[PDB]
């Protein structure tokens, strides 16, 4: 019983894209400061709250989520000198707390507690410990902006150095083995690579690299385990490709104080290269060169023309990462049909020694260094909250031993199961999906179903632990699906490329086909399917509900990119043209105009044979102050959907609500526990209402 607010249209705004007239009646929503835009937000907020108060299960979801999240979490430890560092959360703290210890099972000490600052609105995203374990360099947000300030504490007494480094975003702090300072990659008051000596002001920092000719190029850096080489990587866009420049620190007459003479080992953007180990000038790299599933290769810097396969590309499996460990060994993390496989090999010969396949789920966070003989990593899964495993390669290389193990309170994992099945897409391609649900359910079409996906940027969707998902499973009798659609990197670069640029549409076809399978198999039925996704995943939700609204009961798009014609104009949208195309070019405009959500909102009931169809219940989630995916995307879509489907007609068949949940005074990043729970509880309450699903 629903009251949409008035939303001005500006019928004079029209653009010509290569002879095609595109109206943009909500152009005015692109200024987030005008009082009209603020009034818009205020009205939509009022509408949403009105609708959400009708969703009586929110209070029940919220509590069960809290209860299920309330368990201690020890993150993967790493070692520097004789100390061990890791993150901790007693269960419901806003942000994880950084801790240090002398012994693995000794008394923790708190090094930095983000909860004490701004109510724990944001946590640590940059954290870095010196080689001697005396210094901790970390990134603090000053406000709701993306900008970080780097401060440095002494670990002995938790006292701050006066050093303050502004104008940093995602850079890490890369310590030299002399403990005199670290490399980092700031912006000027055009990214740069700088070295900072402890005890000096930022004005004194040594400049190592800029390129004024190529302002949009951005940087990552690294130093080798032996401390002799500084490596600078240069990237273009969100492409999985990069340059490799090496600086030999042993040959500098006066350390870094001299100043730069880089050996430019790879001076193009043809392939990705990540340095895994070295022995003097002999390097081992991970690369995708002639190998979309990746491989390890070896090259001597003193003869850089000659590259030699160390571990060749697998015909089937993605070599996702690699780590030198225990002086002379490698741990390779393969992704085989979206399931991890760890291999242990000889570093020198590249020969296979052991092979540990992993249960459905995800291993990651391998932070061991080459001198370490004890490797730690984290495992999670739909039904496994979080185990930190340990493997002592020296004394017991065969067995994985449980080091820490999270336990969800009042949750019996044995009542539920997870299967992986493969389903056919429109063009015949098989698509892996994971399906989680109560054991022994009847495939009678009756169950509410949530489907999650992303489909872009080489990103692999793994079936990790979500507490709210358990609630969905247990207390809503639900079925969860995670779809590994194309555009991801699950089957290497060809799987990425088969879902980008001109083939972006395949991504949506893959997702639609997963829903079609879940229906035909008896898991759910048309209109009892909910879809959810974030960023590019929001684009995924919005395009699919335009194209096949008949299939979905509920749809939840989180900070989605919805105006594919103009996305590139804002903030950091320019780095997505690799995957999406750009409307500046006619060939590429022609891809984009077809799926661009705000330019494809159409009344499904006006098509022959489709009179009974409407758009699903739709929640569009965003912050008012997102600097990554600027919220004009979410807003303009909302406005469009509301107009076309609701306010443009006297008594419209669109009865399913169309709202925005708008988070106030929030950033894209860092997301406090609780703030995050609130959001998820709102979206699940909404979902339960839209699918007419009862609580259990």
């Amino acid at each position: 019983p629903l009251h949409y607010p008035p939303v001005r249209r500006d019928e004079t705004v029209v653009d010509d894209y290569f002879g095609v007239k595109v109206a943009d009646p909500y152009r005015w929503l692109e200024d987030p400061n005008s009082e009209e835009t603020k009034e818009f937000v205020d009205n939509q907020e009022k509408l949403a709250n009105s609708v959400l108060e009708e969703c009586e299960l929110i209070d029940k979801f919220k509590q069960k989520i809290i209860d299920f999240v309330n368990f201690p979490r020890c993150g993967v430890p790493f070692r520097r000198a004789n100390k061990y560092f890791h993150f901790y959360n007693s269960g419901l703290q806003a942000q994880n707390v950084f801790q240090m210890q002398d012994d693995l099972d000794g008394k923790p000490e708190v090094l930095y507690d983000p909860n004490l600052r701004e109510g724990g609105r944001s946590g640590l995203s940059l954290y870095s410990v010196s080689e001697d374990a005396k210094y901790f360099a970390f990134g603090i947000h000053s406000g709701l902006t993306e900008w970080v300030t780097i401060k440095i504490l002494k670990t002995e007494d938790r006292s701050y150095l006066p050093d303050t480094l502004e104008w940093v975003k995602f850079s890490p702090a890369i310590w030299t083995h002399d403990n005199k300072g670290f490399f980092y990659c700031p912006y000027p008051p055009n990214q740069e690579a700088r070295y900072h000596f402890l005890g000096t002001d930022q004005s004194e920092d040594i400049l190592l690299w800029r390129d004024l000719e190529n302002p949009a190029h951005h940087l990552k850096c690294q130093i080798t385990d032996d401390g002799k080489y500084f490596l600078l990587y240069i990237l273009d866009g969100c492409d999985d490709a990069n340059k490799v420049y090496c600086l030999d620190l042993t040959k500098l007459p006066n350390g870094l104080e001299s100043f730069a003479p880089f050996m430019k080992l790879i001076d193009s953007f043809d392939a990705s290269y990540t340095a895994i180990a070295n022995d003097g000038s002999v390097f081992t790299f991970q690369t995708n060169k002639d190998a979309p599933r990746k491989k390890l290769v070896r090259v001597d810097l003193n003869n850089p023309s000659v590259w030699t396969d160390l571990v060749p590309e697998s015909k089937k499996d993605l070599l996702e990462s690699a780590h030198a460990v225990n002086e002379n060994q490698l741990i390779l993390r393969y992704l085989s049909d979206v399931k991890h496989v760890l291999e242990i090999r000889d570093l020198e010969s590249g020969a296979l020694q052991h092979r540990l396949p992993i249960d459905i789920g995800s291993v990651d966070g391998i932070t061991a260094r080459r001198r370490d003989s004890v490797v730690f990593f984290k495992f999670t899964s739909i039904l496994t909250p979080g185990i930190v495993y340990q493997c002592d390669l020296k004394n017991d290389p065969t067995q994985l031993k449980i080091f820490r193990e999270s336990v969800v309170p009042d949750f019996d994992r044995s009542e539920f199961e997870v299967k992986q099945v493969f389903v056919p897409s429109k063009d015949g391609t098989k698509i892996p999906i994971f399906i989680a649900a109560r054991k022994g359910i009847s495939l009678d079409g009756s169950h509410p179903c949530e489907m999650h996906g992303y489909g872009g940027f080489g990103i692999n969707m793994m079936p990790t632990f979500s507490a709210s998902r358990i609630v969905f499973l247990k207390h809503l009798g639900g079925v969860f699906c995670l779809a590994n659609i194309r555009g991801g990197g699950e089957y290497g670069e060809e799987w990425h490329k088969a879902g980008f640029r001109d083939k972006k549409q395949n991504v949506f076809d893959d997702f639609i086909s997963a829903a079609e399978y879940l229906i035909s198999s008896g898991y759910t039925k048309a209109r009892r399917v909910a879809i959810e996704g974030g960023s590019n995943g929001g684009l995924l939700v919005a395009a699919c509900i335009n194209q096949r609204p008949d299939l979905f009961g509920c749809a939840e798009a989180n900070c989605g990119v919805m105006d594919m014609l103009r996305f590139h104009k804002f903030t950091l949208g320019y780095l997505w043209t690799g995957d999406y195309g750009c409307s500046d070019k006619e060939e590429e405009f022609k891809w984009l105009i077809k799926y661009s959500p705000i330019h494809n909102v159409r009344r499904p009931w006006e098509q022959p044979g489709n009179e009974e169809t409407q758009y699903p219940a739709t929640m569009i989630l965003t912050a008012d102050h997102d600097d990554r995916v600027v919220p004009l995307h979410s807003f303009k879509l909302l406005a469009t959907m509301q107009h076309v489907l609701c306010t443009s007609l006297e008594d419209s068949p669109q009865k399913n609500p169309i709202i925005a949940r708008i988070q106030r005074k929030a950033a894209a990043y860092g997301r406090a526990t609780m703030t995050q729970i609130a959001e998820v509880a709102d979206r699940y309450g909404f979902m339960a209402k839209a699918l007419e699903a009862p609580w259990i």
Partner: peptide, 6 residues
């Protein structure tokens, strides 16, 4: 470094 697996 998410605070909690919600």
């Amino acid at each position: 470094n998410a605070s909690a697996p919600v």
